[PDB]
């Protein structure tokens, strides 16, 4: 079964995924407020995606006969100076999630927890893909984001980015 | 536009819908832990439903040019003595949500806010339906929930209840 | 190629999967004899499933140019006091198989045998699913198995459980 | 109902069918090890066929309210000097199974057990067909099996023989 | 991100996959020159396969923000005494690739690089399959390759082997 | 048959096509590294195209009973100051390939090698088309490539250019 | 229009194609007589193919307002010591046809006859393909043609070779 360190780290990551989903929702509100409807739509879709990462951890914990515990969730509210600054923060947050998944994989390996190591492989692969997506948005903003016209085009791309 | 009281009450209800979704998720974990997989599945579906109520309020606020603000969310964790006690609490919580929606409708009418009164009609109708559903579950538990066999049948019904 | 410890442990697990398939067949005979036709059908299906786990190990060994060796198989015959006692034993046996797979994964990692570690990931995932299934049956028996009526319903569910 | 001699002989044949299935599996491993992949595939298919003969006896015993008992199964491991020697042994084993079925049919007739005599007719017919198949393979090996080229062609035929 | 040892080993393997693709192309030319058109077609298909292994590594490096670097590629030209000698060399080369992939997986594990360990699992599985294929060709040549007639049949099989 | 000068020039062009394919691959890596994903995708597709030109020469040589010889391939690695500079170099390289094809056609005509002159006509026509494509990209960069916004649009066009 | 040398060479080649078709027919009769029905069928198909080459020249001459003239055709009858000797002669004859086509292409170029040079390109390409086909048959006979069994397999392949 799951060792106490692993139960703790899995619950911690479940709650971080929940917080992250709400952070992406709040960021989408910043985008709507500042007239970036396409960026807002993209971040709403990503908020839904990250909530499914929360659910996958929740269900793994219940499968193993452990009771997942949703923690107090701090407010994700923040101020952003620009669309570029916001997406820089989204990318840094995704890098944090990737790091915490790698730390969880390392904990599973050092605890000789092969079921949890196997379970975490989905997160390792998916975080690789999501980091690549957010890096591409950062690159687009670096290239064309220094004018209102460029931001207009990037926003329109974001409205349908990743289907 | 929206008056300050209405902005405050709409944000408050948005955050209550978010809390409620997580409460239903946590209740589903109690059900899984105690072997009621059908009740767990039903509560997971209802958690998803209530999150859409949160999203509808979030989007109304952004439509009106107001910035919705996700608050600190308290932990929904609680202990329950029985499946019946849990569902009694779910029903009481739905009654609370219904009351808060009625208070919001009254606030809209007294503030002469006809767009918000119109927007809230969806919640009035939907809460009526959801209360009816949870009352029916309470009635089933009152009738047949006093044996393990009866709980087995009710759990199986819950696994597919409301599609 | 495969180190001697790994050849030995893989052959051992292949023979344990074979024994397990026959154990589940024998348990199904107990169920038929005591009038639990649905439980019997379920255990016959699971006996077929576990035999495929044997075959997957057999084929891995032959792929690597090693000769798998089917051992002497002890009789799986046993007495059971009740359907609940039988399924408790089935679940404990599945937990044993899960443990032996985890020990094999650990042996592969400590022997720096990355092909075998990769091969074993299928077993880690599948054993997780099968343990969850047998835990759910134990939970149903704990809830409703204390009457002949309840056993009648559980048997009927088992007749088609997991398709 | 079944007389004690008939219960004993039916259980004996059930266990012989089980042993035979594993013997054919082990023979397929010899074929894989020596590079005869088509012969290996054929023997794996025949191992599955013979296991169904075991299951048919198991189910007949349970139908009649008798508890079939899976015995200790001796290891089928053996050495073979050639593909021809292996298939000679497979054919001799099938002839043994045919003889034991004929002895069972005779026992049913002398015990005035008409349900078991009727049940055994399936085995009489099927063993006739399977002996014919293995005799044809022996004949092919006698004709063309004295060269590596001939063995190559026979192996390729075996890979799809009997669909 | 990727540690310097891992960047170096990944680039090294990318270039080894590129060299291998060209080696298989050159071997196919030997086959064409000596009249083995089916062997030539098979090796051309395998050259295309191995180039895709190069591309997968190239793309992983670019995904991680590292610049893959195609090295100077030595000529793969060699002399072969026979079709059997050529395919023995192809099989030994595939075994080398398998070893280098295992060394890369070990480096990822010892460097606590879980994204790269995950990425490499595709190579571990695929190399297992490709080694099995080339071992089967070696076995066919050992059996039937000692006559011109046998080589004729093996060449015809190779023309469509593995679709 | 082929005269020695023609064998030499055909092998030389085969190896130049191979080098060119890898050069286009390496250029695509520069594009990925600098955030031009559409340019990267276009150059990856063109790398695949040019490899087919290599294969067509390889197969012509083998058809004529000559053994094509893959040479040592120098590293294509280079530095580029800008996307425009990179594509200027791609266009100049395509012009070099066109020139070498024209020199080969002239060599075939002066050697009275009508089969090789006929074979080369495919390259004459295809190089005409590919030069036209790369000239059009140069023209787009000259027109709109002097801003980050313009480069953003050109990159997006390149992502699907020439299907 | 056509110069006298070109009219003469085109008529000469038309008559050589006619003779060749009949030669292939006569060779097919040798094959039938010696029991090689598949080789006979292949040569009958090739006789039909070569007659179409005759017709294409005939029609070119009539298109240009020149009267093609079918010459006296010498008997193609010959003796052959073996199927291999026959196909060696077929291949040498195809090489002769290829040479005469190259001489015709050279004559067209030196006579500045660009319509005839264009017309002949079909023959240059087609003769390349047909030489490759007959070289492959020679290679099969060299490999497997030294036994009656091998000749049996080659004959069976020829029966459907090139559709």
UniProtKB/Swiss-Prot annotation, chains A, B, C, D, E, F, G:
Keyword terms, alphabetized: Cytoplasm, Iron, Iron storage, Metal-binding, Oxidoreductase
Record has Iron as a keyword: yes
Reaction catalysed by this enzyme: 4 Fe(2+) + O2 + 6 H2O = 4 iron(III) oxide-hydroxide + 12 H(+)
Localization, UniProt: Cytoplasm
Signal sequence range: none
Positions that bind Fe cation 1: 17, 50, 53
GO terms for biological process, alphabetical: intracellular iron ion homeostasis; iron ion transport
InterPro entries: Ferritin, Ferritin-like, Ferritin-like_diiron, Ferritin-like_SF, Ferritin_DPS_dom, Ferritin_prok
GO molecular function, one term: ferrous iron binding
Residue numbers binding Fe cation 3: 49, 126, 130
One Gene Ontology CC term in the entry: cytosol
Iron among keywords: yes
Ferritin-like diiron domain ranges (all copies): 2-145
One Pfam family linked to the record: Ferritin
E.C. numbers: 1.16.3.2
Binding site for Fe cation 2: 50, 94, 127, 130
Domain of life: Bacteria
Entries under PANTHER family matching the protein: BACTERIAL NON-HEME FERRITIN (PTHR11431:SF127), FERRITIN (PTHR11431)
Known function: Iron-storage protein.
Subunit structure and binding partners: Homooligomer of 24 subunits that assemble into a spherical protein shell (12 +/- 1 nM diameter) that can sequester at least 2000 iron atoms.
Family: Belongs to the ferritin family. Prokaryotic subfamily.
The name this protein goes by in its record: Bacterial non-heme ferritin
Naturally occurring in which organism (per UniProt): Escherichia coli O157:H7
Source species taxonomy: Bacteria, Pseudomonadati, Pseudomonadota, Gammaproteobacteria, Enterobacterales
